Amino acid sequence: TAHSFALPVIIFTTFWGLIGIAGPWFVPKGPNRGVIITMLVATAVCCYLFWLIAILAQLNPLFGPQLKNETIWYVRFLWE
Amino acid sequence: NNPEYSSFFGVMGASSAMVFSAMGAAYGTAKSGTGIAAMSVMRPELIMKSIIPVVMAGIIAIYGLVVAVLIANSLTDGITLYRSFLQLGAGLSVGLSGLAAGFAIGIVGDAGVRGTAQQPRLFVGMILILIFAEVLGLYGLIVALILSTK
Amino acid sequence: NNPEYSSFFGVMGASSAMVFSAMGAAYGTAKSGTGIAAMSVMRPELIMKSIIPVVMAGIIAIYGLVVAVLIANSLTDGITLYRSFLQLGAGLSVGLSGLAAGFAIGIVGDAGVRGTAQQPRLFVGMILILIFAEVLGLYGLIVALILSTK
Amino acid sequence: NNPEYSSFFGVMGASSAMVFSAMGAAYGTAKSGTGIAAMSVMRPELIMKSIIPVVMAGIIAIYGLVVAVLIANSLTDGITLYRSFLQLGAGLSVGLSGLAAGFAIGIVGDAGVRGTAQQPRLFVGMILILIFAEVLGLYGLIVALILSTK
Amino acid sequence: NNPEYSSFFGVMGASSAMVFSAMGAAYGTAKSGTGIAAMSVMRPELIMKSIIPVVMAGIIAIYGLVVAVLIANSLTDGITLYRSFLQLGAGLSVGLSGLAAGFAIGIVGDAGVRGTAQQPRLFVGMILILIFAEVLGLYGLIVALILSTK
Amino acid sequence: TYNKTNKFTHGFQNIVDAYGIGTYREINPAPYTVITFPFLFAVMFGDFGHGILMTLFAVWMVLRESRILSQKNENEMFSMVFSGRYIILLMGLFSIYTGLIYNDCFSKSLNIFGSSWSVRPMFTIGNWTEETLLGSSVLQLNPAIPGVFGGPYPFGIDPIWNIATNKLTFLNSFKMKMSVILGIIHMLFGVSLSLFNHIYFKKPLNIYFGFIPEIIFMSSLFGYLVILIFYKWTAYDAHSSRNAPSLLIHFINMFLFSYPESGNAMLYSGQKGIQCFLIVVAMLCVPWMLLFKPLILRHQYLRKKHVFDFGDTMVHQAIHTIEYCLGCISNTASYLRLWALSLAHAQLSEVLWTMVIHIGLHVRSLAGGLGLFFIFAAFATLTVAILLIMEGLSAFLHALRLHWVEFQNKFYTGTGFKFLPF
Amino acid sequence: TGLELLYLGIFVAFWACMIVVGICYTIFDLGFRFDVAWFLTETSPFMWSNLGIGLAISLSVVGAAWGIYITGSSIIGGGVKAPRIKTKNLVSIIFCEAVAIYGIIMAIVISNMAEPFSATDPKAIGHRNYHAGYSMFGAGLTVGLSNLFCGVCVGIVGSGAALADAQNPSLFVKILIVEIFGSAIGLFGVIVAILQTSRVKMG
Amino acid sequence: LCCGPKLAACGIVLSAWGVIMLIMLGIFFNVHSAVLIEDVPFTEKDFENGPQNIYNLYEQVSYNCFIAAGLYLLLGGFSFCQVRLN
Numbered sequence A: 001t002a003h004s005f006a007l008p009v010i011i012f013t014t015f016w017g018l019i020g021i022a023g024p025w026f027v028p029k030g031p032n033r034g035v036i037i038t039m040l041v042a043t044a045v046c047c048y049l050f051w052l053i054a055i056l057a058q059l060n061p062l063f064g065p066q067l068k069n070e071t072i073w074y075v076r077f078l079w080e
Numbered sequence B, C, D, E: 001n002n003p004e005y006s007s008f009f010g011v012m013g014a015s016s017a018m019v020f021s022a023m024g025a026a027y028g029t030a031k032s033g034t035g036i037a038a039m040s041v042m043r044p045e046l047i048m049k050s051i052i053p054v055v056m057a058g059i060i061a062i063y064g065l066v067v068a069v070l071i072a073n074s075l076t077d078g079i080t081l082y083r084s085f086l087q088l089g090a091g092l093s094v095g096l097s098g099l100a101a102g103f104a105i106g107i108v109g110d111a112g113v114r115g116t117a118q119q120p121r122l123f124v125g126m127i128l129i130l131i132f133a134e135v136l137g138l139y140g141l142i143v144a145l146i147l148s149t150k
Numbered sequence F: 001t002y003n004k005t006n007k008f009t010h011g012f013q014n015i016v017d018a019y020g021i022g023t024y025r026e027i028n029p030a031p032y033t034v035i036t037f038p039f040l041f042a043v044m045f046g047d048f049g050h051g052i053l054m055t056l057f058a059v060w061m062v063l064r065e066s067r068i069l070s071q072k073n074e075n076e077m078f079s080m081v082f083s084g085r086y087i088i089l090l091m092g093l094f095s096i097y098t099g100l101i102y103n104d105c106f107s108k109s110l111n112i113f114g115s116s117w118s119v120r121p122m123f124t125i126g127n128w129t130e131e132t133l134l135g136s137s138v139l140q141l142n143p144a145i146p147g148v149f150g151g152p153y154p155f156g157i158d159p160i161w162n163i164a165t166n167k168l169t170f171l172n173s174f175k176m177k178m179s180v181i182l183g184i185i186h187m188l189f190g191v192s193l194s195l196f197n198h199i200y201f202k203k204p205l206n207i208y209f210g211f212i213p214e215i216i217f218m219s220s221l222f223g224y225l226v227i228l229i230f231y232k233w234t235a236y237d238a239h240s241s242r243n244a245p246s247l248l249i250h251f252i253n254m255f256l257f258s259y260p261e262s263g264n265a266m267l268y269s270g271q272k273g274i275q276c277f278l279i280v281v282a283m284l285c286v287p288w289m290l291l292f293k294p295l296i297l298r299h300q301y302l303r304k305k306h307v308f309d310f311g312d313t314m315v316h317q318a319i320h321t322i323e324y325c326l327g328c329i330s331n332t333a334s335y336l337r338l339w340a341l342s343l344a345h346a347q348l349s350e351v352l353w354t355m356v357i358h359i360g361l362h363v364r365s366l367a368g369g370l371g372l373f374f375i376f377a378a379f380a381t382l383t384v385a386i387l388l389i390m391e392g393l394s395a396f397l398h399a400l401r402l403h404w405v406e407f408q409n410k411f412y413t414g415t416g417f418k419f420l421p422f
Numbered sequence G: 001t002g003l004e005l006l007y008l009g010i011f012v013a014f015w016a017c018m019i020v021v022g023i024c025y026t027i028f029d030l031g032f033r034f035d036v037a038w039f040l041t042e043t044s045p046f047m048w049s050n051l052g053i054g055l056a057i058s059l060s061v062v063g064a065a066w067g068i069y070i071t072g073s074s075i076i077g078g079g080v081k082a083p084r085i086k087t088k089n090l091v092s093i094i095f096c097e098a099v100a101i102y103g104i105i106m107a108i109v110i111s112n113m114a115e116p117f118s119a120t121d122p123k124a125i126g127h128r129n130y131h132a133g134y135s136m137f138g139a140g141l142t143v144g145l146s147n148l149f150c151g152v153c154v155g156i157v158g159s160g161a162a163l164a165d166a167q168n169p170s171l172f173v174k175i176l177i178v179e180i181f182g183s184a185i186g187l188f189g190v191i192v193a194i195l196q197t198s199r200v201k202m203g
Numbered sequence H: 001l002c003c004g005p006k007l008a009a010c011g012i013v014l015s016a017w018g019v020i021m022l023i024m025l026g027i028f029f030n031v032h033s034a035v036l037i038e039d040v041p042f043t044e045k046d047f048e049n050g051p052q053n054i055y056n057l058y059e060q061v062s063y064n065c066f067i068a069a070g071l072y073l074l075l076g077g078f079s080f081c082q083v084r085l086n
């Protein structure tokens, strides 16, 4: 279960960049163009920051999870 | 190895977490209740709206209960003095924080129920204060969760 | 040879002889000054004659001072524990007797100065009472000396 | 060859000398303060003249400070239990004598400044009484010195 | 080596220096603020000037902080019992002197602020009295320093 | 002040107007609030299940909005909730997102990608045997050995932490760092909006003294803290765990100039010099605000052309500088409220689950299928009474407070009048 | 004053007992039994540290709640005739709550310094562990009590400012300064606590 | 059995919630998800040979969840019938 830190980072960075950068130019012109563009950019920034914090907090762990022996015994069989 | 009395302190913590929080909640549920009884004679329609303080007082009790349970489920026979006093600290934190938050909620709600009876615009204002008071108890709970799982 | 804690009781005797006598004199002076201020509004000419209470209160402090100095001169590195007890008893006697005498002088002087604003003939009587309320301190002093110089 | 905890008492002398005296002084500077304010509304020209009580109260603090500094300069690591007890006695004597003198000065000064707004002739009388109260603190200082320089 | 428990008294010295000085400053600020707020409705143009007492009360806290910092920087786990007692004495001295000065500043500032609301000429007088109270805290600091550096 | 409010933006405009109507033509926090208030709420109310419930309730309110608008009632609470139906919809959506990031759903994770933590390498490369499992009650796991930790979880928190007794140990640090990061970034955005305000109002004095000192102070002191957090996340790993420094101690030492020769080592080469430079710039930002602007105002309005009162201007600038400098610290501290409320919500949901429906799920007999009925109802009502309504309300109001005080104090004045047409 | 009478009686009885007990110990040459060293040493450092953390959080919360209700009663009483208060004076409440925040932060900063010993003999526990316990207790006391007093003071000033605001809008802006001063004390406590546990290390 | 429409609405919404969430819980238990291990009512003897016993207990809890989902389906049907009545 090797979760490489290249596909997640690339995929999410490009997705949120397209939403927050390319999205504004595709918003149809109208009274709400400004507010819609602000919504797009703010959602991109906030969601990407949250995901980046979450993923980086797990990268390079300084200690592993503390698992009961019952759950360790079960997880050995079940999980990869 | 460990002293045979090591489990006392932790136990007391748990009990404290339940007791003081309850006392806090009780005071709130009392004071707000009194205020509601004073308000409801002239403005009956506000009883349901004005029951929010009591609920918040109840929330305080819940926090204590949580911590108490969290400590009452972690008390082992060989509980070391370190864990025992960690649980005592968590219990004191949550209990006294809930006590103070319950006092604040009771007083603020007893004032704000009557105020909202007089001036409707104060209702939201009252709430904007109560939550602050409430989170004081929450802060205690938070520290408890930091301690009893250190 | 002798216990090292004897000097503690000796210095406690000295400091008690000073502190309690000073508290008694302070109470007497405060009460008498309040009475004098109240009296002088209508009867200015008695501002000076009505100062006798304060003087009679100050004397009490002097008593304490005397004993205190005596103890502070009788202290030495190797006072027998019995000598330290003698000094402590003398200090307590003078200090607390002076405290009681100062209370009595304050009350009597306040009452007498207030009354003399309305009845001149009370003055002499007041003086007598103050003397009867001052000899008390003197008595303490006597005992203290009998204990301090033994 | 002396206990390492001997200095404790001596320290509690210095501390006390500066604490209690300060408290006493504070009370003086408090009560007189209020009095001046209360009498400043109607008789502004007496504000500076009616600052004597505060000054006297201030002097009381100085007494303590003196003794405290003296004790704080007489402390040593190997201070004998006897000298430590002497310094504790001096500190308590000066501190509590100054406390009593500060109480008396506060009460007398408040009463005197309030009265002098109504009876000018009382001023001198007040001063005299204040002096007497001040003398009490002085007595303590004397004893303290006698105890602190043996 | 030194005792295991020696650092206890130094720790308590720092804690006292901060806690009691904070108590004094908090009381001074609270009393002065509740006087200033009540005055402002009548004399809105005085608030700024009337902020002077609050500042003075704040200074008391600073004194505590200063001494606290010293005790928190010179306090290691292996300090001699003598230095630990010195730090405890310095902390108690600064803390309780600041407490007394804060009480005096609160009382004097409230009274003088109200009087200035009623009598502008009192302003300067108030300042003088406040200084006389403020100096008390300063005195403690001095003694504390003398004890903490020794 | 007139904002040309819309149906969707009415809720957020009323939300930001509650603390004071904005002055004439100043940067409106409404468009940014429209997203950062639902987001700051979701950071606290982060839960996939509760987010789903909130989204469904808000969608019901939106779809049937016309009916309730026509059928008016006097219920103040329901009217308030309905007026914020769009606010609640956005809050629910963002809470769904954050609950996915937290990997939380009614206090339970998902594991849709597979955990990065494998226990088998402990048995293979490590010393573990069935004997060790029998002898140790809780044991632990270590990523130092090769195959235990297979990289970070691609999306959200790794599921294993739900079943790990070390859950809080890691989650506290992660959420504290997240709260501080989001708070500092929000405050920096506020300061930039203040720059925009000054530029529009043509107050170069504020731009050069004011905004620029403010941003330099904030970035050097607290932006540097976010940089340190991210750098420590990227740099230190399990092998270097032993000597991993604590950023709390390092920040304290930076403030105290207490860089010691003992204890935790420096995070990077030249930390002493860079941190000293940052601190010096931070302190210099205080005189920059305080002394300069009053002197220039006095020079250009009392020496030129010749009411201006220098003493009061200096006092006012000193109050503003003290307020801002203490506010940076107290606001970075207050933004920990996000972590506090998030952890409280998570723990309350966990205890509710394990005290209500663990009773109905932890039954051997098939008859438990009937019990799960009644038990579940209680669970449901509890999840709607304590979590959705009360904890949701607290998180909503605290995101509000963060926006009113911590965020809008940087650029918002709020000294105008609402435009009440005829 | 019945409860006050009970408290005064307990206090007087306890301290008269203490005076007589100290006199008896000193005079009967039994001072060696009054081992303050034994008390401070046998008593586990964990007790001191955990009491310190618990106080750091609980007393801060107590001060925050005290100030919050002190100023909220006045806010909601004044706002009956001048509702604008509820909008403007929440800052006072904020300051009070800020106190509590410091509490938890310091609790964390203290709780991070804890660590078991695996030792019971005072020579084994050692100066480092004993000083760590004492300093954590002292830092908890400092932060908790400074925050308590700061919260109460800010609450009193906020109540005053809310009563002043109900009658003249242009006063709060000038009275908030007092609150700021009243807030500084809190910070001071935190600083001192951080200085007390700067070099604390259990283990 | 006529009743107020508000109670019927609450009943139907609770029935939908119960059905959906308990069906999901049953599916997750039947998949033997480790996240829910704490909810499985196993005993010490179940750790003797292998995980098959724990799998059987997972299946039993999933069956309980599905039974609860069916009961809530019946409750939702009753509430819908009452709504049609009103």
Ligand SMILES: CCCCCCCCCCCCCCCCCC(=O)OC[C@H](COP(=O)([O-])OCC[N+](C)(C)C)OC(=O)CCCCCCCCCCCCCCCCC
Residues within 6 Å of the ligand: B124, B127, F010, F011, F012, F014, F015, F018, F053, F054, F057, F077, F078, F080, F081, F082, F083, F084, F087, F088, F384, F388, F389, F390, F392, F393, F396, F397
């Ligand atoms: C199944 C349950 C799922 C969970 C759903 C509930 C989630 C829990 C959180 C809900 C909080 C709702 C409050 C925010 C919505 C109101 C904001 C808005 O847009 O209105 C502007 C409101 C009301 O609208 P208004 O009337 O001012 O509209 C403007 C009209 N003119 C322009 C004419 C003046 O305006 C304000 O006063 C602004 C400040 C609002 C601050 C909110 C304070 C808290 C309110 C608590 C609500 C009651 C508690 C919930 C009880 C539920 C039980 C019935």
Ligand SMILES: CCCCCCCCCCCCCCCCCC(=O)OC[C@H](COP(=O)([O-])OCC[N+](C)(C)C)OC(=O)CCCCCCCCCCCCCCCCC
Residues within 6 Å of the ligand: G009, G010, G012, G013, G014, G016, G017, G020, G021, G022, G024, G025, G028, G030, G033
């Ligand atoms: C009223 C409100 C409710 C109560 C609240 C306050 C509770 C106060 C708590 C009391 C605990 C005191 C500690 C007890 C241990 C110390 C005793 C001691 O010094 O003696 C033993 C010490 C040491 O004894 P020892 O070490 O030689 O004995 C051998 C050791 N043991 C006994 C353990 C095997 O000295 C003596 O031996 C003195 C013997 C005479 C006893 C003198 C006791 C002092 C007090 C007597 C009068 C009561 C005071 C109050 C007055 C009335 C009320 C105001």
Ligand SMILES: CCCCCCCCCCCCCCCCCC(=O)OC[C@H](COP(=O)([O-])OCC[N+](C)(C)C)OC(=O)CCCCCCCCCCCCCCCCC
Residues within 6 Å of the ligand: G020, G024, G028, G029, G030
């Ligand atoms: C106004 C108040 C009334 C006064 C009395 C107040 C109550 C005090 C009585 C408390 C009960 C204790 C009774 C004695 C119990 C037996 C103790 C024992 O075995 O003693 C061994 C103790 C200690 O052991 P020891 O010293 O005998 O053994 C030798 C020990 N070495 C070798 C170290 C020296 O000593 C005695 O023999 C004491 C006997 C007399 C004790 C009398 C009680 C002491 C307190 C008296 C009051 C103090 C204040 C006086 C002034 C008051 C004025 C207002």
Ligand SMILES: CCCCCCCCCCCCCCCCCC(=O)OC[C@H](COP(=O)([O-])OCC[N+](C)(C)C)OC(=O)CCCCCCCCCCCCCCCCC
Residues within 6 Å of the ligand: C003, C004, C005, C006, C008, C009, C012, C013, C015, C016, C088, D003, D081, G015, G018, G019, G021, G022, G023, G025, G026, G027, G029, G030, G031, G032, G034
């Ligand atoms: C009410 C406010 C507080 C003040 C009063 C109460 C203070 C004390 C309360 C705590 C409990 C008692 C503490 C003392 C314990 C005894 C310690 C001990 O035995 O060792 C002594 C120590 C050591 O005793 P030692 O037997 O080791 O002697 C030394 C021997 N070598 C050097 C060989 C080791 O020495 C002292 O005597 C120190 C003085 C303190 C003890 C006396 C306490 C005084 C109690 C108050 C009454 C004062 C009498 C005068 C009354 C008038 C006052 C103005």
Ligand SMILES: CCCCCCCCCCCCCCCCCCCC(=O)O[C@H](COC(=O)CCCCCCCCCCCCCC)COP(=O)(O)OCCN
Residues within 6 Å of the ligand: A024, A033, A034, A035, A037, A038, A041, A042, A043, A045, A046, A049, F032, F036, F185, F186, F189
């Ligand atoms: C480190 C993480 C944090 C980073 C945050 C900062 C970086 C992101 C923001 C940078 C600035 C983006 C661009 C600013 C606007 C430039 C103007 C042109 C924009 C555009 O194409 O749309 C116009 C409408 O924009 C509008 O109406 C206004 C659009 C405003 C976009 C920015 C708002 C989001 C910022 C908040 C981020 C989230 C919070 C972070 C915690 C169309 O022109 P038009 O014809 O409409 O004419 C304008 C008025 N009508």
Ligand SMILES: CCCCCCCCCCCCCCCCCCCC(=O)O[C@H](COC(=O)CCCCCCCCCCCCCC)COP(=O)(O)OCCN
Residues within 6 Å of the ligand: A019, A032, A035, A036, A039, A040, A043, A044, A047, F006, F007, F008, F009, F090, F093, F094, F096, F097
């Ligand atoms: C679950 C994971 C994802 C969570 C995070 C993303 C959450 C996004 C939340 C926003 C989506 C809902 C928007 C509201 C829907 C209801 C529409 C209300 C009416 C409406 O059209 O509003 C207009 C305002 O623009 C709008 O209504 C805005 C619509 C366009 C918003 C674009 C930004 C969406 C977020 C970024 C992209 C998606 C990311 C996730 C994949 C103007 O009102 P009117 O003119 O109709 O009023 C008529 C009376 N005047």
Ligand SMILES: CCCCCCCCCCCCCCCCCCCC(=O)O[C@H](COC(=O)CCCCCCCCCCCCCC)COP(=O)(O)OCCN
Residues within 6 Å of the ligand: F188, F192, F215, F219, F220, F222, F223, F224, F227, F228, F231, F235, F267, F268, F269, F270, F274
């Ligand atoms: C509106 C937004 C406002 C701004 C908000 C952002 C906050 C700004 C904060 C102040 C300015 C930036 C931060 C300056 C402080 C130093 C940052 C150090 C970061 C760090 O840990 O990097 C390590 C040090 O780099 C090195 O080893 C290289 C030498 C040391 C660092 C040199 C300075 C780099 C930053 C340049 C200025 C950037 C300005 C950004 C605004 C990587 O090093 P390692 O781990 O490989 O080495 C270690 C073994 N030797």
Ligand SMILES: CCCCCCCCCCCCCCCCCCCC(=O)O[C@H](COC(=O)CCCCCCCCCCCCCC)COP(=O)(O)OCCN
Residues within 6 Å of the ligand: G001, G002, G003, G004, G005, G006, G007, G009, G010, G011, G013
């Ligand atoms: C003065 C002479 C010498 C005395 C020496 C002996 C020691 C002191 C014992 C008391 C002596 C004085 C008599 C007081 C009786 C108790 C207090 C008053 C009556 C009372 O308790 O009733 C109400 C409280 O309710 C209750 O019944 C609640 C009280 C019980 C609470 C127990 C928890 C405290 C335990 C102690 C540890 C805490 C230490 C704190 C320093 C208070 O009446 P009111 O004032 O409302 O009405 C006015 C008239 N009662």
Ligand SMILES: CCCCCCCCCCCCCCCCCCCC(=O)O[C@H](COC(=O)CCCCCCCCCCCCCC)COP(=O)(O)OCCN
Residues within 6 Å of the ligand: D005, D008, D009, D012, E012, E016, G031, G032, G033, G034, G035, G036, G037, G038
């Ligand atoms: C007029 C009013 C009365 C004023 C007089 C002062 C009253 C203070 C009350 C405290 C008790 C008096 C102080 C002196 C007695 C101390 C105990 C001596 C007994 C003794 O020999 O114990 C040593 C250890 O104690 C020690 O060495 C302990 C040293 C510390 C003693 C002082 C601590 C008191 C508590 C201060 C708290 C302050 C809190 C501030 C907020 C032996 O030890 P060893 O090494 O020979 O062991 C050998 C084991 N094999």
Ligand SMILES: CCCCCCCCCCCCCCCCCC(=O)OC[C@@H](O)COP(=O)(O)OCC[N+](C)(C)C
Residues within 6 Å of the ligand: A078, A079, F049, F052, F053, F056, F105, F106, F108, F109, F110, F111, F112, F113, F114, F115, H013, H016, H017, H020, H021, H024, H025, H027, H028, H031, H032, H033, H034, H035, H036
């Ligand atoms: C009223 C409106 C309606 C409300 C709706 C609410 C819906 C809530 C339903 C869910 C509640 C319970 C949450 C429990 C979630 C845990 C389930 C879980 O973990 O899922 C995944 C497991 O199946 C598999 O994981 P595994 O077998 O351990 O690993 C294998 C995973 N690989 C194959 C990807 C590697």
Ligand SMILES: CC(C)CCC[C@@H](C)[C@H]1CC[C@H]2[C@@H]3CC=C4C[C@@H](O)CC[C@]4(C)[C@H]3CC[C@]12C
Residues within 6 Å of the ligand: C062, C065, C066, C067, C069, C070, C073
């Ligand atoms: C205010 C004045 C006039 C009142 C009396 C106070 C003075 C004179 C008193 C107070 C203390 C007294 C001293 C107390 C103790 C001693 C030691 C003794 O072996 C001989 C006399 C001598 C030295 C005393 C002399 C007189 C004395 C100094």
Ligand SMILES: CC(C)CCC[C@@H](C)[C@H]1CC[C@H]2[C@@H]3CC=C4C[C@@H](O)CC[C@]4(C)[C@H]3CC[C@]12C
Residues within 6 Å of the ligand: D062, D065, D066, D067, D069, D070, D073
């Ligand atoms: C005006 C300033 C100095 C403070 C006011 C109080 C002054 C007068 C007090 C405070 C402490 C006092 C000192 C305390 C101790 C000693 C040691 C003694 O052997 C000689 C006098 C001397 C040196 C004192 C002189 C007076 C003194 C300096």
Ligand SMILES: CC(C)CCC[C@@H](C)[C@H]1CC[C@H]2[C@@H]3CC=C4C[C@@H](O)CC[C@]4(C)[C@H]3CC[C@]12C
Residues within 6 Å of the ligand: D138, D141, D142, D143, D145, D146, D147, D149, D150
């Ligand atoms: C009216 C005047 C003299 C009193 C005011 C000053 C007081 C504090 C001073 C003046 C002279 C001082 C005395 C002079 C010398 C000594 C000798 C010394 O070993 C003990 C203190 C003692 C006995 C002093 C006590 C305090 C003292 C009386």
Ligand SMILES: *[C@@H]1O[C@H](CO)[C@@H](O)[C@H](O)[C@H]1NC(C)=O
Residues within 6 Å of the ligand: F125, F126, F127
């Ligand atoms: C034994 O345990 C250590 C510490 O976990 C580990 O690094 C090492 O590889 C193990 N050695 C074996 C199994 O031989």
